[PDB]
């Protein structure tokens with residue numbers, strides 16, 4: 001009913017859907033585990049996968065008018081409604097569970113802050129899910145309040161993220177002597193010269209780092225998810241998604257190098273730990289920074305780039321501003337996924353290729369708003385939160401986004417190589433073997449990311465294919 | 475030019491192509507490693523895969539007239555000439571390399587017999603390849619002598635197998651006291667009661683047993699390989715292949731249970747090892763059979779169901795008859811594969827879907843005899859013999875037959891489930907989901923048998939697909 005296009009929708013939705021819970025919490029630990037010279041490489045590899053998927057989605061976008069939904073209609077019209085429906089359903093489930101993961105990360109950070117600050121609630125183990133129930137109810141309420149309300153919430157949350165990043169960079173740029181027990185020392189070149197090497201940890205490897213980091217990098221093409229509600233389809237999507245991926249990669253690289261050069265892996269924060277600069281053996285950069293707060297090798301000391309989780313916030317002044325940055329990032333990501341998934345399910349139900357899902361069709365609202373999809377995603381997310389401890393199935397579903405991207409790329413490759421009556425791409429570049437390379441990279445990542453879960457993913461895709469084909473749509 | 479059908483071709487070719495080098499050598503060791511209660515199970519599982527593949531091939535056969543070749547034309551006419559050519563090429567390569575491995579196993583057994591009997595040649599390590607070259611020359615000479623010549627050789631070789639099995643069963647049925655140091659004791663119930671349990675060994679497991687045994691069970695549907703030279707296509711193939719698989723499974727089960735109940739895992743063959751039957755502790759079945767030739771647990775003793783390799787021959791009188799049995803079986807299997815592969819390559823080259831293979835087309839001879847394919851298979855086999863030590867790449871090519879079977883089963887499933895204009899099966903049974911279940915078994919076995927080699931097989935199939943698609947045949 002309301003046509004809004006490139007700027008607001010694409011920019012803020014991509015910004016706050018790629019910027020997940022990882023950025024402020026997991027990034028510091030993952031860059032303290034792996035040096036900058038290799039964290040940059042892993043971010044660049046994930047960026048390569050992301051940008052090839054974006055180019056592939058843009059290639060499908062410039063073909064022609066999109067009826068609606070996301071990957072579903074694209075895969076259907078390109079390489080068969082059976083694959084289209086399978087990919088749409090699997091990706092909708094992936095997004096519906098990513099909603100629960102985003103909001104449970106929100107729950108973890110909020111309960112950690114609450115417990116640290118003043119008090120704690122009864123049964124802190126499940127207090128995360130307890131607060132998650134109410135915050136998911138609130139998120140559903142604000143999401144089902146039309147599109148203008150959610151757009152306003154998205155833009156103000158992006159503003160909050162921008163102010164949080166500004167506070168972070170301002171705090172790091174200005175050195176403070178109060179953080180002598182901590183790793184923050186003010187961009188000392190000693191910390192930089194000791195961080196460009198891949199200095200791993202006890203049990204984490206390159207592939208463990210990649211599987212921890214990657215779910216942050218997914219959430220792209222959210223504009224393509226809701227292509228049926230954009231003012232300028234087939235034109236805004238490429239120029240928006242490419243710029244969003246570029247800026248997100250740049251900000252990840254910048255924050256990674258800054259936090260790597262700003263902190264140290266050995267910060268024994270304690271009252272006794274001072275900057276006396278005692279004439280010790282000086283094997284580590286501790287004495288080069290401060291004589292006290294050293295000797296973390298013998299026993300596991302307090303924290304610092306290896307154990308701390310509020311390092312990204314405590315590095316800069318006004319810690320509540322950073323914490324609100326975490327809250328806004330996770331809430332915005334959950335909102336973006338919770339809006340993207342049900343309209344895709346509506347696209348699935350529109351063509352009636354699934355006889356069983358007669359319901360969950362177009363309902364109330366001035367536009368084609370799938371409220372029933374909103375309730376369905378609400379219930380799925382609530383059930384998965386009630387399950388709790390999502391890390392166990394985190395790499396089970398980490399390859400469902402891989403499945404979606406790989407089917408996108410393979411569909412583009414099949415439509416380009418094998419001539420089709422209506423392929424007719426329009427975006428200017430498109431060496432079509434790049435889509436094949438992206439598909440191969442997606443499959444390689446799938447096999448790396450819990451190969452058993454990958455095999456289960458192909459089994460589920462084949463089951464969906466045989467189910468939809470046996471139903472003989474007509 | 476000559477139409478010969480069910481009896482001679484189908485019967486003898488299936489008998490002598492499924493009956494490979496394994497039966498007389500590896501079977502005794504594998505049944506000494508895996509008990510009857512589990513060896514029967516593994517044989518039955520391989521039989522289930524084999525018979526599902528046979529039923530699937532029969533389903534394709536009764537559709538209509540076959541132009542020629544094997545899985546190539548079937549897969550093409552069912553689900554695309556691209557997959558047809560990919561499957562035909564990969565299966566032809568698999569058969570061409572299996573020829574080399576069959577003949578090098580023949581080389582191993584013949585050089586072992588020669589070294590044991592009178593003398594040995596220089597450089598016994600490569601004496602196997604030395605004799606293999608000349609015996610491959612003899613094989614190509616007898617194979618390129620028309621169809622009647624190879625049929626006569628095949629039938630006389632199969633007769634030799636019948637006499638070998640008769641000698642074996644006659645020797646086992648009649649107990650001999652001369653084999654007291656050996657495990658042959660005359661169907662004593664003590665040996666049977668102590669062998670029906672899955673008594674494994676140091677490092678071999680169930681899946682190692684499966685990967686060792688399975689290449690014996692492959693070689694089926696050789697009549698379907700040469701469907702272009704059969705008197706009664708689409709009618710003889712099912713009733714022949716099913717009966718051949720049934721009888722081969724029955725003879726494997728019978729020989730396995732007989733050799734299990736006939737020998738023991740502890741036969742310390744030595745002059746001191748007698749049948750004195752001393753009153754020892756008698757924890758093992760040795761003293762239960764004969765007091766001497768016991769105590770093989772402390773140190774690795776001579777042989778017997780765990781180390782012996784000519785036990786299948788020494789169990790029965792007239793060992794040279796058994797040795798001729800091995801020779802005839804391996805020569806017949808190599809001949810069958812060396813006849814099946816090049817006509818399939820001829821079918822590949824006939825449709826010209828591979829433009830680069832302009833040569834290797836129909837040549838001299840009264841019938842459509844692909845001599846150029848004979849030389850091609852000769853060169854590939856000679857190269858792989860010169861490579862030597864084929865066991866390293868045995869699990870590599872073990873999944874190529876799995877690939878052919880899985881694609882054939884998926885062909886039947888896709889043609890039956892997804893409606894096709896000309897499916898029209900005629901064989902009576904066909905609960906169509908059996909094709910799906912067999913395809914799933916084939917994929918699971920592929921993953922078990924060197925999952926990395928399975929992944930390589932999928933990569934090669936995808937490469938062949940994209941190569942044949944990019945060439946845009948018209």
Ligand SMILES: CCCCNc1cc(C(=O)O)cc(S(N)(=O)=O)c1Oc1ccccc1
Pocket residue numbers: 018019020021022023026094098101102104105212213214215216217218219333390391394397398401
């Ligand atoms: C299939 C989609 C998965 C989304 N989950 C996710 C997204 C991001 C991100 O970058 O947006 C980062 C991570 S994380 N903490 O680095 O592993 C994620 O895993 C979570 C999130 C919170 C709780 C436990 C696991």
Ligand SMILES: CCCCNc1cc(C(=O)O)cc(S(N)(=O)=O)c1Oc1ccccc1
Pocket residue numbers: 492493494495496497500568572575576578579686687688689690691692807864865868871872873875
């Ligand atoms: C892809 C097809 C392979 C066929 N090769 C094969 C067939 C059979 C059989 O049952 O016909 C048994 C075996 S074996 N000795 O059990 O491993 C085989 O592998 C050999 C053979 C001899 C030397 C080393 C490996």
Ligand SMILES: [Cl-]
Pocket residue numbers: 091219220401404405
């Ligand atoms: Cl996605």
Ligand SMILES: [Cl-]
Pocket residue numbers: 565693694875878879
């Ligand atoms: Cl085969």
